Each structure stands twice: as C-alpha cells, then as structure tokens.
C-alpha cells in the first residue's frame, strides 16, 4: 500500500522544513541584533550551522533511502553523505562541550556570566573545532579506515545501490568514544559544576541563571536524543547482532530530529523570543528576586509608595511626598521615574540599612548570629520587607529559630499576618529558613 510511503514523505518533508526554518531564524537573530553578540551566541550559531547542514545535506537523503528502499545517489555521495553526517554530530558535541567550559570560566570570574574570550578568539576556536572535527570524521571514512572485512560489507561496498555503513569493530568503538562519549562526559561533568557554583554563589530565578538552565536543556535533550543510538551501537559491536536494523535506524532518527529542537528551547530566553518576534513579522541577588525591580513609583502590597528594588519612599499617602523624597534620595527632579543604575544604587544603600538596623535591635541580634549565612539573608529579607518593626514583633518564631526548631519556626510564619499578604515570597523565604538552602531561589 502506497499510503504509507506518501504519508512519511509529507511527515519527513516537514521535519526537514522545520529544521532549516528554525535554524535560519536563529542565525539571523544573532547576526542582525547587536544585543545578542555574545561569545555564548557565537557558539549558538555554529551549533545551528551544524543543524542546518543536517537539514540540507544529510536528513533528506536519509529520507530518500527509506522511502526508495535503496540508495540511488551512487557510492561517491554515499561516502560523502556519511562523512558529513558524522561531521555535524561531532562538531556539535565538541561545541556543546566548549559552551559548558566557557560558562565555567564565566561563573568563576567577577561578572558571573562574562566569557573570558574575545569575539575573535571565540571564532578561531570555532574554526578549529570544525577543522579538527572534520579531520576526525572525513579522514577515517574517505581513507576507508572504517571499512569492515566481512563479506556483506565487501558486497555492499561494491554495489552502487547499497549504502549501509558497515564498519570494523575497532572504528565503531574508537569513533563513538573520541567523537561522542569523551566530549559527552566532560560536558556532563564540567557543566554540572557550573550549575552548582551558580546556586552556590547566591533555584533558577535570576534571569541569567535561567539562561544557564536553557543551555543545560540544550545539552540535556541532545544527550537524550543521541544516547540511545550510541548505546545500542556499542552493545551490538561488542557482543553480536542482537540489534535489528529498523531499531537502529529509528534510534538514529531520534538524533536526527534533534536538529530542529534547539530553536524552540531558545524561546525560553526572553532575548531570543523578542528577537524571533521581530524577525517573524510580529542577599543582594536574593532580594532582587523577591522584591523585583520597577523604574516608576508603584504601590506595595500594603499600599505604600515604593520604587526600584523594593525601596520604600514614604509612609505618607500623598504621591507628591513620595516624589519629593525620591528627588532628595536621587539628587534630581525624577517626577516619579528613575534609571536602573539609580534604582540599585539605592538598593545597595537600602540593604546596608537592613543589616545595620538589625545590629542594633534588642534580642534580634543574637538570633542573627545564631543562624548561618543562608538563613541570615532569609531574615534580612524579612527585615528589608518589614523593618526591625515587625520581624522583631513575632518572638514566637524568633526563639524557635534561635533554638534551631525550624520545622516549628516554619509553621508559625505560615500563619503570620505576613504570610497571607505575600504568600509566595512568604514560603520561598520560609523554606530558606526550614531547609537552610537556596532550593527556592
């Protein structure tokens, strides 16, 4: 029944169509927009060029082979088609592994998200990766080092109409290791320590810390898409032909459709998402998460005028008093609006208050030093939000916290009047109190 063959042809055409579309879209954004000219994005690019070559040069011919039930392009393209196929898969993991190492030298430097690389140094490293990846992919195939010596391989090598990738047991293992597993586990190791040094230096609430998560998803899917293919490759090569070829060809196509997946993982970033939308016609950091940042005078939960990163302006209800205090604080006539530089110049000053105002407040200083650094900030947060007025005004939990009775301290603050007004920020800091960790930030 020819119903199946035309059904998959449509389904395969769209797969190729999706891959080429979403990756021309990605390459376009990073090139058009000057905001996106990061070294991290120069790697994003070649990652999309490797996906574009698959969409054009590799995937369609693998679709023709399945539907035509044979290879119609001769043995020259047959050895070229695969040497390109493996060039795109090796140049990728070698780039997804450079990202993870580049983001490691970024989170160990003052600006936690600044590459230590020049743009130019970033793009000779890219040239290198492609040169090296090509010479460890094209050379062993064009030089026939992959070739098997059993009779089936020999007969398929001789048919212009057969293009199976029969390989000698040494090449199958020495390639999977050097081209895949080695960069895989360097990546999975090095990047997992990028993730925890982020959560250490305070999850996934800061904007940039979600960018690191977005990269982790890229790697995360890439591994899961190409790993089943590469495991069954090793189990067959070592033992015997217990793997069918229709299961090997399906597990391979899972890594094939991966090329069309990155561009939509990128929609997680607000940066790419607004870029695509134009292309397509359409304690310091702890409080910054819990406070927010607004450049215009707004009203907090209790109705008080606030600006910046939760900076109280006045208890007075006359907006003119709020603007007058704000002008005195900033040193110019704001008319209710400030800049981000001014807003966190104030925020740096306002945090200094919340610590000195607890250095001097009755029995609420001993509880401060009774707790660790991760709970000190969880109380400086409560002060910052409510002063030493209210957080000193519920000694039931304060003693509970001093006595390290945290499972109890966390139930009391869940009934506190403060809990029912800001419930979500109430429990993120309650958990920071109970579990003594950054788990909620």
């Amino acid at each position: 029944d020819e119903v199946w063959v035309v059904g998959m042809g449509i389904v395969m055409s769209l797969i190729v169509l999706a891959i080429v579309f979403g990756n021309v879209l990605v390459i376009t954004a990073i090139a058009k927009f000057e905001r996106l000219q990061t070294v991290t994005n120069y790697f994003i690019t070649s990652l999309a060029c490797a996906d574009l070559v698959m969409g054009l040069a590799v995937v369609p011919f693998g679709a023709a082979h399945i539907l035509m039930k044979m290879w119609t392009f001769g043995n020259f393209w047959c050895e070229f088609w695969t040497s390109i196929d493996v060039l795109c898969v090796t140049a990728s993991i070698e780039t997804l592994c450079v990202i993870a190492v580049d983001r490691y030298f970024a989170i160990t430097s003052p600006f936690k998200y600044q590459s230590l690389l020049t743009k130019n140094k970033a793009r000779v490293i890219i040239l290198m990766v492609w040169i090296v990846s090509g010479l460890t992919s094209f050379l062993p195939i064009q030089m026939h080092w992959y070739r098997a010596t059993h009779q089936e391989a020999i007969n398929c090598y001789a048919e212009e109409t057969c293009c199976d990738f029969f390989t000698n047991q040494a090449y199958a293992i020495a390639s999977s290791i050097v081209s895949f597993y080695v960069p895989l586990v360097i990546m999975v190791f090095v990047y997992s320590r990028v993730f925890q040094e982020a959560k250490r230096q305070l999850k996934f609430c800061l904007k940039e810390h979600k960018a690191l998560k977005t990269l982790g998803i890229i790697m995360g899917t890439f591994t899961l898409c190409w790993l089943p293919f590469f495991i069954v490759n090793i189990v067959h090569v070592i033992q015997d032909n217990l793997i069918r070829k229709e299961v090997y060809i399906l597990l391979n196509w899972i890594g094939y459709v991966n090329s069309g997946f990155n561009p939509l993982i990128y929609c997680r970033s607000p940066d790419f998402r607004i870029a695509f939308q134009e292309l397509l016609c359409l304690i310091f950091e702890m409080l910054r998460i819990d406070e927010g940042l607004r450049l215009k005078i707004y009203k907090d939960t209790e109705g008080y005028y606030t600006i910046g990163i939760g900076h109280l302006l006045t208890k007075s209800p006359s907006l003119n008093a709020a603007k007058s205090e704000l002008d005195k604080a900033i040193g110019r006539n704001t008319n209710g609006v400030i800049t981000k530089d001014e807003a966190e110049k104030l925020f740096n000053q306002d945090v200094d208050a919340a610590v000195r105002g607890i250095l001097r407040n009755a029995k609420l200083k001993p509880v401060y030093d009774s707790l660790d650094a991760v709970r000190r900030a969880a109380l400086i947060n409560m002060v910052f939000q409510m002063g030493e007025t209210g957080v000193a005004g519920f000694t039931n939990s304060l003693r509970m916290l001093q006595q390290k009775r945290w499972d109890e301290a966390a139930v009391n603050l869940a009934k506190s009047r403060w809990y029912n007004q800001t419930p979500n920020r109430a429990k993120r800091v309650i958990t920071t109190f109970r579990t003594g960790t950054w788990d909620a930030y």
Epitope: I44, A106, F111
Partner: nanobody, 118 residues
Framework: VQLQESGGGLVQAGGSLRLSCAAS????????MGWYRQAPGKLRELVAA???????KYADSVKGRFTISRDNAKNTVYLQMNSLKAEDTAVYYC?????????????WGQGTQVTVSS
C-alpha cells in the same frame, strides 16, 4: 557593576578638557566603552565609542575634535575634547557594555556636565 565619572569644567570656546571614567564589576578589558552627551532640550547623543578591541567611532558633529581612549590597566576610559564650541555644551555620561550569556547589558555613570562659555 559600577561606573565613576570625573572631569567637568567651565571652558572658554576653543578651549579643551578631558573626561575620565573608572569601572568595577566586570573585566574592563572585554567591555566596549563610549561617552554620550545630552544638552537641555536635546536628546541623548553618542559622542565617541571605543570598542573592546580598540576601534573608535566619533559623532559627525564632533569629528576630528574628540579622541576617545582607554587604559585597561587602570580600568578607565578617557575622552580628550579639544576645540570646544558653544554647541558642545551638554551633560556627558559614561557607558560600559558588559556581555552576559545570551545578551549584552548597558551601564552608565551618574554623570558630568560640560559647558562652553562664549
């Protein structure tokens, strides 16, 4: 990151002066830099930009009369305005661009004012 301007004075026309800007919180080596002015009744305007690699761009209205320059050792960027005209009078601000993961960020200093006296 934080920026710290210095160097604004009253100058007779045709005179000269230089502006300075210190920076902290990034690798000043890697950041692009430049100055912007804004005169009352006029919008903020780029005057001169020194990129991280060292390339320079100057506003046409001030071309050949201004030299942006940087010293990555002292974490500072300099602008030597010469041949000041009455039109150049504005408030000058220091800009540092610091790249992150997917995007580049802007940072400005508190500001300095220059006013040429007829």
């Amino acid at each position: 990151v934080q920026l710290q301007e210095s160097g604004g004075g009253l100058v007779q026309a045709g005179g000269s002066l230089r502006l300075s800007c210190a920076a902290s919180g990034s690798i000043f080596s890697l950041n692009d830099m430049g100055w912007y002015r804004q005169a009352p009744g006029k919008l903020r305007e780029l005057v001169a930009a020194i990129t991280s690699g060292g390339s320079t761009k100057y506003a046409d209205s001030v071309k050949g009369r201004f030299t942006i320059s940087r010293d990555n050792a002292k974490n500072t960027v300099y602008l030597q305005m010469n041949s000041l005209k009455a039109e150049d009078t504005a408030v000058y601000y220091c800009n540092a661009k610091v790249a992150g993961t997917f995007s580049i960020y802007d940072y400005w200093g508190q500001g300095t004012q220059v006013t040429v006296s007829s």
